[PDB]
Amino acid sequence: TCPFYKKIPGTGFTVDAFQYGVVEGCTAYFLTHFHSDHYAGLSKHFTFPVYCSEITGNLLKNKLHVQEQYIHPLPLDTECIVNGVKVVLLDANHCPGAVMILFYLPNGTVILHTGDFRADPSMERSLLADQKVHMLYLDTTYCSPEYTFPSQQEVIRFAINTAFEAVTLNPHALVVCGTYSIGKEKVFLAIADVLGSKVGMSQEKYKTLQCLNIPEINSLITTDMCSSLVHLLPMMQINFKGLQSHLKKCGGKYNQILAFRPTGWTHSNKFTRIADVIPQTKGNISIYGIPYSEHSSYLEMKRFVQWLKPQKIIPTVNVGTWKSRSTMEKYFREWKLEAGY
Numbered sequence: 105t106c107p108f109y110k111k112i113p114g115t116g117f118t119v120d121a122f123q124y125g126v127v128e129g130c131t132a133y134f135l136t137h138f139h140s141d142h143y144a145g146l147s148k149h150f151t152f153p154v155y156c157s158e159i160t161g162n163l164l165k166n167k168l169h170v171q172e173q174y175i176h177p178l179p180l181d182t183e184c185i186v187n188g189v190k191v192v193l194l195d196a197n198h199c200p201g202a203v204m205i206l207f208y209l210p211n212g213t214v215i216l217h218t219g220d221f222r223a224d225p226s227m228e229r230s231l232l233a234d235q236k237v238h239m240l241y242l243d244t245t246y247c248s249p250e251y252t253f254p255s256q257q258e259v260i261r262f263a264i265n266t267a268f269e270a271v272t273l274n275p276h277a278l279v280v281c282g283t284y285s286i287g288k289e290k291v292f293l294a295i296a297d298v299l300g301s302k303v304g305m306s307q308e309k310y311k312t313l314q315c316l317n318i319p320e321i322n323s324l325i326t327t328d329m330c331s332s333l334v335h336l337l338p339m340m341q342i343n344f345k346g347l348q349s350h351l352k353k354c355g356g357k358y359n360q361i362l363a364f365r366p367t368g369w370t371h372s373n374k375f376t377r378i379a380d381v382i383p384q385t386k387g388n389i390s391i392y393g394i395p396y397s398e399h400s401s402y403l404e405m406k407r408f409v410q411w412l413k414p415q416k417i418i419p420t421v422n423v424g425t426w427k428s429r430s431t432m433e434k435y436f437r438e439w440k441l442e443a444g445y
């Protein structure tokens with residue numbers, strides 16, 4: 105059965121609620137982004153209205169075969185009317201096509217559902233600036249002060265400089281980047297751009313990228329692995345055995361692999377700066393875990409919430425344990441006392 109924090113009071117709406125069958129009283133299902141914990145349940149057999157971004161709708165149609173007549177894409181930053189209720193989709197700074205959703209309830213209440221997001225000061229100048237928000241359904245993935253990580257721009261500088269140095273020292277080195285979902289495309293696109301290469305990948309992954317409206321994509325990606333010196337592999341294969349096996353398949357073109365695993369947070373964050381990050385090495389294979397996050401750090405989350413000043417916060421992540429829930433509630437009260445709302 106559908107949990108309460110996926111239901112929007114005073115409407116017929118649910119958010120990211122496709123794995124519970126026919127939800128009682130739901131007239132329109134919203135989908136914030138194309139990540140499997142959120143789309144779980146969707147297919148060609150779905151016959152209710154799904155509301156989403158244009159990019160998410162391309163992925164529903166091509167990857168899951170949802171029929172066109174049930175996909176309702178909405179433009180961003182535009183007031184739209186859905187089953188008699190005004191809504192707005194805003195950029196979530198998560199993966200491609202990911203949105204936050206503002207609902208303007210008929211009784212005067214305003215609700216913001218962040219979906220999954222990486223808070224940023226740029227959000228303080230969207231359509232949020234223009235009215236009060238009463239309730240916030242908040243992505244609390246990293247809601248504890250131990251979660252620090254660098255900006256995306258610092259992480260990409262490290263990756264580009266690392267790859268460019270390695271391949272300039274050894275033109276026979278292959279670079280490999282792990283992936284298992286959409287998101288984090290800058291990692292592999294920035295490395296390919298510095299090296300003067302396209303990114304090579306499976307036909308299934310190429311299909312997924314072609315759904316994303318990324319400009320000049322036919323220029324940056326390919327299925328011809330033999331012409332590429334940056335390869336994308338499933339995340340599961342980014343280990344010494346998987347990589348040794350891949351290097352065999354390349355037929356003596358290469359004699360070294362430099363591989364990247366973009367994780368979210370790892371506890372090497374609490375002791376080490378990005379500049380100081382080192383790989384795991386075995387023989388002619390090196391693996392770098394890089395802290396490229398598409399979720400708010402603690403400080404970024406705190407800043408957003410203290411700017412927005414909601415009357416009530418409903419967490420959507422880490423809600424399954426009493427210890428997690430109690431910890432989160434204590435930070436919310438701190439933020440409110442420090443800021444004065």
Ligand code: NI
Pocket residue numbers: 137139198220
């Ligand atoms: Ni996500």
